[PDB]
Amino acid sequence: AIKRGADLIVEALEEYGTEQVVGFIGHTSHFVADAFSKSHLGKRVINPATELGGAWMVNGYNYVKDRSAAVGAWHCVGNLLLHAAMQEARTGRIPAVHIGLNSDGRLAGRSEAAQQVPWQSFTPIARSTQRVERLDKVGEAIHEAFRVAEGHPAGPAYVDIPFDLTADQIDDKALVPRGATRAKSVLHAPNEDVREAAAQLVAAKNPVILAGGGVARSGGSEALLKLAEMVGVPVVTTSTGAGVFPETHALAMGSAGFCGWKSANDMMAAADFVLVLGSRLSDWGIAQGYITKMPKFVHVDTDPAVLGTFYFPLLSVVADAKTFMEQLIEVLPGTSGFKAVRYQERENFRQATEFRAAWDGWVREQESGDGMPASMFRAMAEVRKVQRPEDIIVTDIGNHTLPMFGGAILQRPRRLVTSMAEGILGCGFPMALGAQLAEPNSRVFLGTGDGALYYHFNEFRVAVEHKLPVITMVFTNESYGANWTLMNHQFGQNNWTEFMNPDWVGIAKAFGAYGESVRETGDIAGALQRAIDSGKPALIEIPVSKTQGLASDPVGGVGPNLLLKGREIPVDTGGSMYPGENLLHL
Amino acid sequence: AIKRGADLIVEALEEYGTEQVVGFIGHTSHFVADAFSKSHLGKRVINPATELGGAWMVNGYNYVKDRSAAVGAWHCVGNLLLHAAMQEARTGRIPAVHIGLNSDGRLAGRSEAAQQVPWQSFTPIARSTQRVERLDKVGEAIHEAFRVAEGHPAGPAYVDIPFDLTADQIDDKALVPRGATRAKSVLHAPNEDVREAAAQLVAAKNPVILAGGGVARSGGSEALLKLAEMVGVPVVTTSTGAGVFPETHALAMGSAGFCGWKSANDMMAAADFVLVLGSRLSDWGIAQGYITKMPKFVHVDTDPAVLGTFYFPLLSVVADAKTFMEQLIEVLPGTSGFKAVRYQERENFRQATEFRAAWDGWVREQESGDGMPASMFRAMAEVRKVQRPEDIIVTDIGNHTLPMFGGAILQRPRRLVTSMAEGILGCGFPMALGAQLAEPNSRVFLGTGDGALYYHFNEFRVAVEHKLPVITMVFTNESYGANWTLMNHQFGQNNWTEFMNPDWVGIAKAFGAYGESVRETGDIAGALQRAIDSGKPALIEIPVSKTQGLASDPVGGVGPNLLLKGREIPVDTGGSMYPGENLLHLK
Amino acid sequence: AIKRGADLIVEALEEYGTEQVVGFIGHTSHFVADAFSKSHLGKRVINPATELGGAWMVNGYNYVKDRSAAVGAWHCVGNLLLHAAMQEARTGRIPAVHIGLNSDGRLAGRSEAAQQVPWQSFTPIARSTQRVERLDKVGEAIHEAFRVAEGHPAGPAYVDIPFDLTADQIDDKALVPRGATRAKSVLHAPNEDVREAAAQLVAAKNPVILAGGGVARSGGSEALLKLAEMVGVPVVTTSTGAGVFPETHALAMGSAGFCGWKSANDMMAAADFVLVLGSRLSDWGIAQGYITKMPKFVHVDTDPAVLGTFYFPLLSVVADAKTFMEQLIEVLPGTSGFKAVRYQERENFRQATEFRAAWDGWVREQESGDGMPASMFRAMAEVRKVQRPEDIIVTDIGNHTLPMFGGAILQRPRRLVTSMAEGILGCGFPMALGAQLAEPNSRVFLGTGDGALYYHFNEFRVAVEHKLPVITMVFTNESYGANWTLMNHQFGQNNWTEFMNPDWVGIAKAFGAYGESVRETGDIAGALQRAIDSGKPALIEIPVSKTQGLASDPVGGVGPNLLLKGREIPVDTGGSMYPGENLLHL
Ligand SMILES: Cc1cc2nc3c(=O)[nH]c(=O)nc-3n(C[C@H](O)[C@H](O)[C@H](O)COP(=O)(O)OP(=O)(O)OC[C@H]3O[C@@H](n4cnc5c(N)ncnc54)[C@H](O)[C@@H]3O)c2cc1C
Ligand SMILES: Cc1cc2nc3c(=O)[nH]c(=O)nc-3n(C[C@H](O)[C@H](O)[C@H](O)COP(=O)(O)OP(=O)(O)OC[C@H]3O[C@@H](n4cnc5c(N)ncnc54)[C@H](O)[C@@H]3O)c2cc1C
Ligand SMILES: Cc1cc2nc3c(=O)[nH]c(=O)nc-3n(C[C@H](O)[C@H](O)[C@H](O)COP(=O)(O)OP(=O)(O)OC[C@H]3O[C@@H](n4cnc5c(N)ncnc54)[C@H](O)[C@@H]3O)c2cc1C
Ligand SMILES: Cc1ncc(C[n+]2csc(CCOP(=O)(O)OP(=O)(O)O)c2C)c(N)n1
Ligand SMILES: Cc1ncc(C[n+]2csc(CCOP(=O)(O)OP(=O)(O)O)c2C)c(N)n1
Ligand SMILES: Cc1ncc(C[n+]2csc(CCOP(=O)(O)OP(=O)(O)O)c2C)c(N)n1
Ligand SMILES: [Cl-]
Ligand SMILES: [Cl-]
Ligand SMILES: [Cl-]
Ligand SMILES: [Mg+2]
Ligand SMILES: [Mg+2]
Ligand SMILES: [Mg+2]
Ligand SMILES: [Mg+2]
């Protein structure tokens, strides 16, 4: 059948499992938008305030789905706004396909052309960058983008299509590849690696299992609970792994790292052996700026590139996390030294429970005060009174990230959302909208700084139009508080940190959202209940300190080193001059 | 003397003429911010709501100054938001230096590193992209950045500095290059070319001078006025040249192009000869999608790369526009055929004045009407009543661009501001703020669509804190109106075009800005007076139709061709298969 | 200890298993060459005639080793000659680390600098491109290069080091990473994939096992012989898999593809099911220009990116080849329908043996003629009379490639060498020298065209100095014979194809190599024996036809389509003009 390129693009996106489009109109996306209007997927299009806001919504949707279920589709020059969000998808292992419609290919390469988008600016960012030259390659390119996006590692794929190809027509026989099959990701380890790992776990005096985001992608929660109880081993997570192990269990230490739980950092400092499952041991994760001292460890991952890149394991294993744990459960009864004892009667139990109790007491101290400015831990304690086990906690980047991580106590995977890998400010609100779109049975609570909310609160248009009842707490300190704090630690003086806020309640009201300020009432619990009862997206303005959280609160961190001290650098004495130095020798 | 890298960056920036810093804090920019607080640049730093809004401020400031007087200074990952504004600077010839402070160079190349910014993403965009490896190269790199940014062509330069270098210390002797004097840009044409141009000008029956943005950069307004009156030749501009020739003058046809003045398009369709000065004859400018048919022309530019790239001139000349005009004024009295008479007495005068009068009549007609929605031409007629020669008009991108260009009548250079080269939606508000910062005692009027204002109205934080009294008209139609209109033509139905607006008056009030709606009153005139009296940034809501402007209004355009008709493309029958086609051959 | 950067580079290369250096002097490599002179590896440095010749020697050495045992080390501007060889390492999955010493970092970025090498020219080619900015990163960068080079997929890694860092000195504590461990590559499939594959193999009427170069990298020869005999299934290979199955066995069909064995192409056209082990199903391999019609197939690979990129399998499996075959052997006795029958009594045996016999008869016809010009199959039959099972057959690219592939009958893996993935002319001689260096118990026979030998016969300097007794047959036709042939098929006329040859015997004698021409004697067997007895590198000049081989001989190929027919292309009628068209409208 003769088909337009725009209709072939839509067909391909449906074939590969696209649920949700985030698209922006312009003459280069006109044919694609027309084609979407005639398709099932046309019913699910978000038109965001900006393309960067929309790209963040793709990230939040796909982070919780672990596939490229949301897809961006962008008129030419709007693609120039994608880079920040695309970079987070790359290091954060978020599958994300983006289709950029460039200007007419007839006008490419002309020096005085308008809106000829430099697609090679994505080459250092996307896991796959393709410029499509020919209509008969449009299906093939989209198939490749999905294959790359949803691989191991997951990430972003960008497809640049000059829009004349979307108007042009071709007979469609076999053009969109169909019948594609994926290999299973249930990679099994060899027996001798399993037996080694089991022997180490049993022999250790103070073992720990470290579960990262790969345990969530693997689906390994059940196996992890069984394995931890069978061996009697405390569980530490990364921030993307939090919730794969129920955080109210006796063995749950929470997340390690610099915005994590001190019980987890205590346990990592005490441990003599770690089994690492589905973690990349990253800079702002377990590595803490490449300062953390890892105990002897076994490292299990589906991506060999993460294994031994920086931390050298006792043993590196290419295997699926759930599968490896199931293999361990099978081998453990025939492992020398193994005895079936209830985890509460193991010799290591009391130490772990003491670390957790100390942390819980510290959290109770942070949360229990009343009045203004509010503690962000109090705010989170109020959220946990109204929180369901499928609900999603979202945060932005700043001082506030620490209380959001520390006050989230989670029972399910992929419930904690932010720009985890890159720490890009402003992510929180639009990522929360994308997560809400993906998870309509989840209540979504966002704790955002004021500096952060400034970036993409324009997306209240989307929240209101699409009836997305995200509950946003804006923590107001009229500051980039992390930076106020750190600059005063570093220099004794802040600069570039302070700003005004609008009347946020007035902003919410102007968009037809629910708005309330607790500046005078302190009534966080009441405001949460009113916001939930509204059925609308909500904005609760909560005054906070400039200093509480990431840049101040002691959670057992060692890094990262970002207040670095300068070194004195030898000049070059080889004889060559600086530019303009010739004038000094006259 | 031992200096930190941060201090050396500030010293270099000062040496090369920086007046205004737009900066964003984060740990990688901490040392730089601390160093700026010790400088006379520290006082005035703008900390924008987002880095892309700030980069648009840099572009508005520098577009009106014609030098990189504003600089950006950005914490690592905030650099990832620069690319759209940087691309406008590249094709739009805006000088702009951006200093990106990357994460620690010790951590670079590690696969699981955080915030290691891919500076090579700028390589296809900036005129110059540099990654600094060594502290002793920090001065040198910044010197090079200004050299490129302020050359011919002007454009953006990006410098990536791992921030450990900003903390490190070194002895400063000769490290910051000082004391350069740049080459003059008053490039003179060969006398033979000047003579040839004068001979064509005099011989033509219906000549036109086409003056682009290079006449503004050249400072050629006085020479152009003398030349045009001496020969008695109508003046057409580009959108970046508008205002180089006073648009109240009887010879002024306005700007040619598809959002231009029909008088200018009529003139260019009538002309038998054009002298093109300081124009790149661009796609969304004079070329209108490479459809415009140029008469025989002489082309004068400082950048050889624009001369003969697409339109082949009769004669191409590498020269400065003001200089070339001065040369031609000197030779004209000795040119065979030249007659010294008042321009009003020339045979070609009446036709030009007729084009202008017809256009002015049409504009008057668009200003008329008595209710709601309002005409955007009416809105511009009201702005003209309160507009001085030094005042700046800013637009965003959409249907509203055509009435803003058609209602702006300018008499000085560099008074009309937008994302000219790239058409990037959202530019208007933050570029207006940057123009206001560059010219604190000029009044700045912005006409913006509602889809446009959505992008960077967060920068009301900057406008209110810095008391930048931009007067913004937001034209409300609850739509991407250009697209609503074009898609209804193309397909019979719009899609992806309609959206909710907030209460814009309420948004302004929540920031402490002046706000008013004319929806019930029609009182644009009073709203402009109240907005001006407020001394605050102001927002005037004006409801408009979905259709008025770029997608509907006839201005004599021929292009561009964006409502494409597709072609039917043949399938490859050479034998090779599609992916997956193997399954279709199984029996 | 305080150490120079040059000494740290040497230390790192030794730590990661480097055996052989190929290096080129210049002031930027002076410190590195001095450092090598003080080390164990210093004893194994080849200084090639050119850097491209040397890069090809790295490729040949590492192709047969399946690790980056050879390493290039190059003065600045000589790195500009590496790209061709580097591209073959990338698509050909050859591990190869190259260390480029750039000019002084103090002079980088200056517009009028000399010898500042654009290392970003490698970014689209190498699997890893790194520019080292800091002395304390030199060890770390080399460790990363090896990790990437020796991964799955294998490939080239380029490290650019400004040479001032190689003169500079630093305390060495922990700078060169030591104690690195690799994960095993014995990835196991899940049982249900094993059982599926076994059920298909047993149920098929006319199965085939297709073994590619991954069976060689895996070490799977023993398991493949067992599995093929147990199930009674003919074996087809790719050109990089040839020799993993003994090519004299009754079940051996040889290599499929356009320069392969017709028995293999016949068997692929007859088969109802294929088990593909360690093949990427590539363009100039099994795909034959994306024309080959694959039967229903199971696809087993360690690199998920190859699985389902173009040919969509019944089932895709991420697993090691040897391991998967061992899993199949274990499952087969409990697979429904399986009976233990001698392979000679299976119903499919006679068909396979008939295909092989037809091919063998055709080869005997090609080889059996005497006189001049010689048949290249006769030449290969003479080599097989003097060939040991560890000996290596090398070819260049041209008409001659077909008789070299067709006359090679191999018993061991990694014995057939050329620029397999990219077909880059001139590879053969320097790749043969690298293979000889790696495999000193192998006699190396190169069959090269004349056009090919022209590129790197300057490397006779290396062959003679290092006493590398490669036996080179130069097939002389005074032509780019493939192109003479194909152009006459395509157009009825050749152009740019014909050239003179030097007196090749005189060239060999001038270098102190053994030289002989059979132009008048026909005495190929005698010349081989004299060349072997010399103990020297040898050059035997053998006149051949312009047309025999790749461009003419029918081996059951279907592709690739490189004599493509042009299509008539619609002009653009949108209204926009061409450059300069304005003058036509005046
Ligand atoms: C301000 C800020 C503070 C932060 N504080 C912390 C903190 O305190 N603690 C913390 O942990 N992080 C923190 N982060 C997040 C951190 O930067 C990283 O994003 C995070 O630690 C990475 O988690 P991960 O190692 O589990 O790997 P992910 O990025 O989640 O990657 C998943 C890993 O699992 C592997 N994998 C995927 N599927 C499978 C499978 N089926 N089987 C096996 N392996 C699989 C992948 O190959 C990869 O190695 C912070 C971020 C910011 C911005
Ligand atoms: C929606 C929309 C509508 C638009 N409609 C129009 C329209 O109707 N008409 C229009 O003109 N544009 C229009 N534009 C703008 C258009 O895209 C271009 O930005 C503009 O036309 C370019 O102007 P220019 O040719 O003068 O060159 P500029 O981009 O201003 O560049 C300056 C030129 O002068 C040269 N130069 C610089 N200094 C000197 C010197 N000293 N001497 C000599 N030469 C010098 C430079 O090398 C260059 O060639 C529109 C843009 C948009 C987004
Ligand atoms: C002139 C010319 C003619 C040619 N003619 C032919 C021809 O007739 N026939 C032919 O086959 N080729 C031919 N080639 C070569 C062809 O271009 C390819 O180089 C070759 O076919 C690729 O072989 P392969 O598919 O086995 O993959 P390779 O390139 O050998 O790659 C190895 C594959 O095995 C996988 N792998 C690696 N280790 C393992 C493991 N442990 N377990 C499982 N999988 C593993 C890899 O991921 C990869 O997919 C020709 C080349 C030229 C230049
Ligand atoms: C795009 C971008 N710009 C700047 C930063 C640097 N940064 C990291 S945290 C932070 C403070 C954010 O302020 P806010 O949201 O108010 O949170 P608070 O620290 O006050 O809790 C900043 C500016 C960044 N990570 N990303
Ligand atoms: C970043 C970006 N996204 C999309 C476009 C496409 N576009 C061009 S004009 C326009 C309409 C803008 O709407 P608005 O500001 O309301 O103006 P109106 O057409 O209603 O006057 C759009 C979406 C663009 N140029 N840039
Ligand atoms: C570097 C490079 N240049 C050109 C070619 C194109 N090419 C492929 S085969 C061939 C013929 C080689 O001639 P020769 O070595 O004499 O072999 P013959 O065809 O005569 O057997 C040529 C030129 C190539 N593959 N690589
Ligand atoms: Cl547009
Ligand atoms: Cl940050
Ligand atoms: Cl040299
Ligand atoms: Mg804050
Ligand atoms: Mg100069
Ligand atoms: Mg609008
Ligand atoms: Mg030849």
UniProtKB/Swiss-Prot annotation, chains A, C:
Molecular function, one GO term: flavin adenine dinucleotide binding
Binding site for Mg(2+): 450, 477
CDD domains with a match to the protein in the record: TPP_enzymes, TPP_PYR_POX_like
Cofactor remark: Binds 1 Mg(2+) ion per subunit. Binds 1 thiamine pyrophosphate per subunit.
Ranges for region Thiamine pyrophosphate binding: 399-479
Reaction(s) this enzyme catalyzes, per UniProt: cyclohexan-1,2-dione + H2O = 6-oxohexanoate + H(+)
Keywords (A to Z) from UniProt: FAD, Flavoprotein, Hydrolase, Magnesium, Metal-binding, Thiamine pyrophosphate
EC number: 3.7.1.11
GO cellular component: acetolactate synthase complex
GO biological process, one term: isoleucine biosynthetic process
Cofactor: Mg(2+); thiamine diphosphate; FAD
Keyword Flavoprotein in annotation: yes
Entry binding sites for thiamine diphosphate: 51
A Pfam cross-reference name: TPP_enzyme_C
pH dependence: Optimum pH is 8.
Function of the protein: Catalyzes the ring-opening cleavage of the alicyclic alcohol cyclohexane-1,2-dione.
Protein family according to the UniProt entry: Belongs to the TPP enzyme family.
Assembly and binders: Homodimer.
Protein name: Cyclohexane-1,2-dione hydrolase
Species in which this protein is naturally found: Azoarcus sp
